Amino acid sequence: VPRGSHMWIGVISLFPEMFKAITEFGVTGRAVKHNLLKVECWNPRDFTFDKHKTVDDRPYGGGPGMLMMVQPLRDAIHTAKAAAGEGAKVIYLSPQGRKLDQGGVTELAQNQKLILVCGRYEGIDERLIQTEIDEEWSIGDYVLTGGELPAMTLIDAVARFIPGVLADGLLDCPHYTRPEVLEGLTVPPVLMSGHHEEIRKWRLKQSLQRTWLRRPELLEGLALTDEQRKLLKEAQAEHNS
Amino acid sequence: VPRGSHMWIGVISLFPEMFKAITEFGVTGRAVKHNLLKVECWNPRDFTFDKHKTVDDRPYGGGPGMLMMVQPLRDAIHTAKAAAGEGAKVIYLSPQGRKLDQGGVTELAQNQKLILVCGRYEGIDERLIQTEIDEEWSIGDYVLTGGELPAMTLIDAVARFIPGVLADGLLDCPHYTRPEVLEGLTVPPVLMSGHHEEIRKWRLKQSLQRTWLRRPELLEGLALTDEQRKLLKEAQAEHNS
Ligand SMILES: Nc1ncnc2c1ncn2[C@@H]1O[C@H](CO)[C@@H](O)[C@H]1O
Ligand SMILES: Nc1ncnc2c1ncn2[C@@H]1O[C@H](CO)[C@@H](O)[C@H]1O
Numbered sequence: 001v002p003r004g005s006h007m008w009i010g011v012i013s014l015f016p017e018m019f020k021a022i023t024e025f026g027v028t029g030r031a032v033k034h035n036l037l038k039v040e041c042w043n044p045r046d047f048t049f050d051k052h053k054t055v056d057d058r059p060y061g062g063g064p065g066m067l068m069m070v071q072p073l074r075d076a077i078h079t080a081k082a083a084a085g086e087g088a089k090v091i092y093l094s095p096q097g098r099k100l101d102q103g104g105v106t107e108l109a110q111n112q113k114l115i116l117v118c119g120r121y122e123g124i125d126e127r128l129i130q131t132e133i134d135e136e137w138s139i140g141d142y143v144l145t146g147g148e149l150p151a152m153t154l155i156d157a158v159a160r161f162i163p164g165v166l167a168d169g170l171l172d173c174p175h176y177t178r179p180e181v182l183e184g185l186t187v188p189p190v191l192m193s194g195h196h197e198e199i200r201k202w203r204l205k206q207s208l209q210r211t212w213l214r215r216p217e218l219l220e221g222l223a224l225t226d227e228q229r230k231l232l233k234e235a236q237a238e239h240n241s
Numbered sequence: 242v243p244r245g246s247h248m249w250i251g252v253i254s255l256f257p258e259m260f261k262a263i264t265e266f267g268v269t270g271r272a273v274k275h276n277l278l279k280v281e282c283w284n285p286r287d288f289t290f291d292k293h294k295t296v297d298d299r300p301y302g303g304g305p306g307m308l309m310m311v312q313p314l315r316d317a318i319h320t321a322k323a324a325a326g327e328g329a330k331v332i333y334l335s336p337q338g339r340k341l342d343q344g345g346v347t348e349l350a351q352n353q354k355l356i357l358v359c360g361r362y363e364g365i366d367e368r369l370i371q372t373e374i375d376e377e378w379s380i381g382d383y384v385l386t387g388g389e390l391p392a393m394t395l396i397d398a399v400a401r402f403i404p405g406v407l408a409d410g411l412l413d414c415p416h417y418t419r420p421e422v423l424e425g426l427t428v429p430p431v432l433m434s435g436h437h438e439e440i441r442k443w444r445l446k447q448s449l450q451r452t453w454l455r456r457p458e459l460l461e462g463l464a465l466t467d468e469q470r471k472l473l474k475e476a477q478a479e480h481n482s
Binding site: 014015017018019020021022024025026027028057058059060061062067069070094095096099100101102104105120122123124125126127128130131139140141142143144145146148149150152153156157159160167171172174175176177178179182183185187190191192196199203210214218 | 255256258259260261262263265266267268269298299300301302303308310311335336337340341342343345346361363364365366367368369371372380381382383384385386387389390391393394397398400401408412413415416417418419420423424426428431432433437440444451455459
């Protein structure tokens with residue numbers, strides 16, 4: 001199985017078993033079994049030395065909640081970097097990071113090795129971010145209970161760009177399958193015509209219309225081709241009239 | 242255990258076992274064990290009648306990829322709705338949906354029952370979205386291999402708003418814990434002062450500064466209090482000088 005552009009992802013997490021969600025199911029799972037993608041985990045808890053294996057600590061300045069204990073976390077990260085070798089970008093998932101989007105995903109997919117730091121509690125010591133982290137990334141403007149889901153969201157997204165694992169700046173067009181009529185709703189005839197060029201145009205027009213109606217801001221960031229400007233103008237006219 | 246505002250989430254997915262990621266670990270896992278949150282899954286595969294339990298189908302109009310087979314998917318959804326009863330908002334996760342953000346999460350947390358439809362392959366028939374789905378939500382402007390992660394991201398986010406499970410429009414302030422000095426980096430003295438009012442102000446100022454430097458757009462959507470306008474002006478002056 002062509003492993004040309006395989007990708008290696010190191011993960012620091014208090015709950016390594018969560019990653020089975022992507023390593024044991026669907027396309028990512030097959031990607032892993034086929035060695036196109038490799039996810040390796042290290043758990044801070046294994047780096048503790050106290051009897052109760054404490055992985056959290058109190059924050060200076062008081063306040064609700066806890067933080068990840070520095071020592072065990074720091075040791076796990078160092079161990080991960082040693083295993084990844086040179087040329088491994090370390091990422092910390094958090095809401096204060098760069099907001100992930102398609103463009104950001106493709107950039108991340110350029111890396112052959114990545115180490116993802118998943119925090120729990122209120123996060124991690126600001127100083128570790130300065131001394132151990134290369135970049136902070138957020139999957140969205142919302143707060144989660146841990147960095148695992150965000151980490152898995154990032155892995156899943158980049159995995160699609162790995163050759164062998166498997167829009168145009170616009171939203172997807174509507175998709176249809178059997179049956180021809182579903183609760184009175186029929187499949188658009190053009191899709192049944194077999195006319196590939198018309199089908200291409202119809203789908204592109206739908207994407208433009210749909211993007212225009214639901215996410216107009218996305219259109220400003222685009223430099224439309226003459227064909228796209230025409231199809232868009234058409235959809236808007238049909239929508240107005 | 243006060244189950245006052247418990248929440249019920251129905252899930253339609255070809256990979257129910259993925260949800261263990263949130264039902265068996267951390268705060269969401271404890272929330273589930275304590276009955277504050279209940280996640281119930283239905284798998285389309287169980288609703289197939291052919292020998293090979295086929296859950297995908299070809300899209301009309303040709304094109305790469307497949308779609309979820311309508312019949313098994315439709316049947317699972319109907320079964321889920323019957324179990325949820327009246328007053329259950331059905332959500333389909335997809336990039337064409339409303340982009341999730343803190344505000345959207347709080348709105349979703351108002352619901353006592355939710356049914357999340359997770360697609361695989363290229364998604365689901367456009368017509369099912371019109372006849373079975375109430376709202377489409379996206380966790381971000383990036384494409385994933387399935388709706389499970391997005392579904393779990395949504396559940397995790399709303400779960401935090403359920404009383405008993407556990408920012409200000411601004412990014413979080415930096416957090417610190419032991420030790421006082423880490424690789425030459427010392428904890429900001431104010432945090433060690435014990436002066437709660439100064440600590441409050443210092444954190445608020447950091448959030449304003451941090452939000453201003455990393456995500457200035459987030460500030461335009463805010464109507465700052467006099468205190469916040471003062472602290473922000475201060476941070477910008479200190480940053481300039
Ligand atoms: N939207 C998000 N994107 C990335 N990481 C997040 C997000 N929300 C919370 N986290 C991380 O989960 C942990 C607990 O909040 C912290 O490490 C925090 O940075
Ligand atoms: N960013 C996203 N948010 C929500 N659902 C998504 C996202 N990306 C892909 N999906 C869903 O995963 C499945 C395969 O793309 C489809 O149901 C699709 O809508």
